[PDB]
Design an enzyme around this catalytic site. Structure first.
Site, PDB file in Angstrom:
ATOM      1  N   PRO A  63      24.857  73.220  29.315  1.00 12.38           N
ATOM      2  CA  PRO A  63      23.746  73.748  30.102  1.00 12.38           C
ATOM      3  C   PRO A  63      23.028  72.658  30.881  1.00 12.38           C
ATOM      4  O   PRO A  63      22.726  72.853  32.059  1.00 12.38           O
ATOM      5  CB  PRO A  63      22.820  74.334  29.032  1.00 12.38           C
ATOM      6  CG  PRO A  63      23.084  73.504  27.825  1.00 12.38           C
ATOM      7  CD  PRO A  63      24.548  73.179  27.875  1.00 12.38           C
ATOM      8  N   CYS A  64      22.748  71.538  30.219  1.00 16.20           N
ATOM      9  CA  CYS A  64      21.969  70.463  30.818  1.00 16.20           C
ATOM     10  C   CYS A  64      20.889  71.109  31.701  1.00 16.20           C
ATOM     11  O   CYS A  64      20.847  70.856  32.895  1.00 16.20           O
ATOM     12  CB  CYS A  64      22.869  69.498  31.615  1.00 16.20           C
ATOM     13  SG  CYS A  64      23.305  70.005  33.306  1.00 16.20           S
TER      14      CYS A  64
END
Ligand SMILES: Nc1ncnc2c1ncn2[C@@H]1O[C@H](CSCC[C@H](N)C(=O)O)[C@@H](O)[C@H]1O
Length: 680
Positions: free
Chosen positions: A324-325
């Site tokens: 996701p970061c």
């Protein structure tokens, strides 16, 4: 000095050879030129003069010619330093012991014409090749100014090799419900390869359980990428120890292993089953806590290893990730970890899905970081962006996929769109040329763009409260799509089961929307059934420059049974007033730009066209291209999410195919993108 050596000018094969001039203009050409003391022939690698303060170019000399204008020119095709690629500045990266070789280069076919004045020197650029041995390489490299193993083309930021049934394991990280993972596994079949998601890692209990149910024979780890990796390293250690050449309460058996997350003492813990106690009384105990008991551990590991309950570097043949970061480094360590795990396991391929912004954020810090890390490890790489719709979904969902194929293996292309959805690329700069589409070739894919009606049309009526996972359709699939969406695992080759039928045959699952607290429910009650339903249609109304919603004097508010109003104050405020999506409804001829993890009608125009309720979970699953047989679990909101996050299954399923071809090495070269034979 200043000019061309001389010799035939090659009569003319010149035009035969390269007639772009002969229409750059050429009086004639030469096979040699003299600058200062020295003469350069063709095929000589050379340093060339860039603008002041620029790095010297590098080139292979292709053309020496007497262009008209009377000038003496040479055209060489370009050589590339990692810092001249899309990835400039990310050469500064190191993953593990992998660093970018300072003298290494990637060979474009990109050429430009200059006067001979700009030739500094001529360089020795040696060419490598994957197959070689210690020193075959080490020689060459130790003897050479530079080397090139791969061509860098900017079309897809592709770095790939240059010259000068069957089963592969899969590791899904950030798996969620495994939309990408399954889809890939489905395409693999088309290619004819048996790709199995032997492992999946996600830290959410529910996503995990969906997944496992739908792929029972997979090892689903619910934990963090961090823990997983550490666990992964230690496990290797153990296999060393126990495998072969030597390298009150009573615990009865060991049913599990981890690197404790909440258990959080950062040490291997093992699940414990003890006499008289059900699975419910089990607990995780630190390895040291355990006594000398070999038989328990020795057996646990030995037998685990046999079952490959956990990956070793040797065995993973593909790995995908969704890291996701969300959002230099702030968190996003997630994206970084992805590459750490990859670095450890050396999969034959890598695939990475992410939101398009990777490239936008700061000029794809993230994107170029992934790419850079890929190449640093000597991994064929390219990346391009795909739209979900083009693959036959009633939505426009654009995301970024990174292909990491090994030097020893072919590099999978990207599939071209199967649908006529019009894509206007938000096509950032550096990555503007990384996208999958048809430029203006009349690929004919009437593939009439899908619309909502087509997706959810055969849909037993259901209301705001429906607490039944599994109802019945009580209807026949009425559109090409719908007919396709409900198909046996057998016909779609989900195959997860043993050639036997899957559970939930022909059933309908997870068809149920979230429940609006009565206030909201009532508000949706008063929404009209027209095409453009919005809160605007409700007591009190507005017009103005803004289209802004301002209460219509003369009519005062309202009371829900609870006495709350119909129109919350927030609805009025939005965009300062836009038709907006507050309590909005959609038609059959409407498309969702993107299916979102969270369905609440407050801002999103999420409510069913005719039914007074929010688009049910299954309606979104179909929307996201999920086979109707894919079961989802946990609170309605949670599985709503599980779906929201997922990468579209058809897209991932095309990926699975191109890849599939690659693993078995059947496909053309140097072509960024494929086209799929039947409906693939
Ligand atoms: N720190 C972490 N450790 C393990 N998984 C994480 C994580 N942070 C986020 N995730 C995973 O990120 C996922 C969101 S994206 C998952 C989409 C997936 N490809 C699919 O469509 O099936 C979540 O499922 C979550 O499990």
């Amino acid at each position: 000095e200043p000019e061309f050596i001389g010799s035939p000018v090659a009569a003319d094969e010149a035009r035969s050879n390269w007639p772009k001039r002969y229409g750059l203009k050429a009086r004639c050409h030469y096979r040699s030129a003299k600058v200062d003391n020295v003469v350069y022939c063709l095929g000589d690698d050379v340093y060339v003069k860039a603008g002041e303060n620029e790095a010297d170019y590098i080139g292979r000399i292709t053309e020496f010619f007497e262009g008209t204008d009377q000038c003496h020119y040479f055209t060489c095709r370009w050589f590339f330093r990692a810092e001249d690629t899309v990835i400039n500045s990310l050469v500064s990266i190191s993953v593990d012991g992998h660093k970018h070789d300072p003298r290494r280069v990637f060979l474009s076919e990109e050429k430009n014409d200059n006067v001979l004045d700009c030739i500094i020197s001529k360089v020795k650029i040696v060419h490598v090749d994957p197959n070689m041995d210690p020193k075959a390489k080490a020689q060459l490299i130790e003897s050479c100014d530079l080397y090139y193993d791969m061509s860098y083309s900017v079309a897809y930021s592709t770095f790939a090799n240059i010259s000068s049934t069957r089963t592969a394991t899969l590791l899904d990280l950030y798996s969620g419900c495994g939309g990408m993972s399954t889809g890939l596994c489905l395409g693999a079949a088309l290619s004819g390869l048996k790709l199995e998601t032997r492992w999946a890692v996600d830290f959410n209990s529910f996503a995990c359980q969906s997944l496992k149910y739908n792929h029972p024979q997979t090892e689903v780890r619910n934990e963090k990428a961090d823990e997983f990796l550490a666990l992964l390293k230690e496990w290797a250690v153990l296999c060393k120890k126990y495998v072969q050449d030597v390298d009150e309460f009573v615990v009865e058996k060991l049913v599990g292993i981890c690197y404790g997350g909440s258990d959080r003492e950062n040490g291997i813990y093992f699940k414990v089953q003890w006499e008289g106690y059900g699975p419910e009384e089990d607990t995780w105990e630190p390895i040291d806590n355990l006594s000398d008991c070999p038989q328990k551990i020795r057996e646990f590991v030995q037998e685990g290893h046999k079952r490959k309950i956990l990956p070793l570097p040797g065995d993973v043949d593909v790995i995908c990730g969704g890291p996701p970061c969300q959002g230099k480094d702030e968190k996003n360590k997630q994206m970084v970890t992805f590459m750490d795990i990859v670095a450890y396991l050396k999969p034959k391929y890598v695939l990475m899905e992410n939101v398009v912004d990777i490239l936008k954020f700061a000029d794809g810090y993230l994107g170029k970081y992934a790419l850079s890390c890929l190449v640093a490890m000597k991994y064929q790489a390219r990346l391009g962006m795909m739209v979900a719709g083009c693959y036959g979904l009633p939505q426009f969902r654009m995301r970024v996929f990174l292909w990491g194929a090994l030097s020893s293996m072919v590099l999978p292309k990207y599939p071209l769109p199967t649908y006529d959805v019009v894509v206007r690329g938000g096509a950032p700069n550096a990555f503007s040329q990384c996208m999958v589409a048809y430029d203006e070739t009349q690929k004919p894919s009437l593939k009439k763009a899908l619309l909502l009606g087509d997706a959810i049309s055969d849909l037993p009526k259901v209301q705001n409260h429906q607490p039944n996972d599994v109802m019945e359709y009580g209807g026949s699939p009425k559109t090409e799509f719908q007919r396709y969406i409900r198909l046996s695992r057998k016909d779609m080759l989900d195959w997860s089961f043993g050639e036997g039928a899957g559970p939930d045959e022909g059933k309908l699952l997870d068809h149920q929307p979230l429940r609006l607290n009565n206030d909201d429910y009532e508000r949706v009650q008063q929404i009209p059934v027209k095409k453009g339903a919005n809160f605007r249609d409700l007591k009190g109304v507005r017009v103005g420059a803004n289209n802004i919603v301002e209460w219509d004097p003369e009519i005062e508010r309202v009371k829900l049974s609870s006495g709350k109003p119909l129109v919350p104050d927030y609805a009025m405020s939005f965009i300062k007033g836009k038709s907006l999506k507050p309590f909005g409804r959609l038609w059959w001829d409407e498309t969702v730009p993107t299916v979102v993890t969270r369905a609440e009608p407050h801002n999103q125009v999420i409510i069913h066209p005719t039914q007074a309720r929010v688009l049910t979970i299954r309606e979104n699953a179909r929307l996201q291209g999920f086979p109707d047989y894919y079961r989802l679990f946990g609170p309605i909101k949670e599985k709503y999410i599980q779906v929201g996050n997922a990468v579209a299954v058809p897209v991932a399923r095309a990926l699975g195919y191109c890849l599939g071809q690659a693993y078995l090495g059947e496909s053309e070269g140097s072509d960024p993108l494929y086209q799929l034979p039947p409906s693939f």
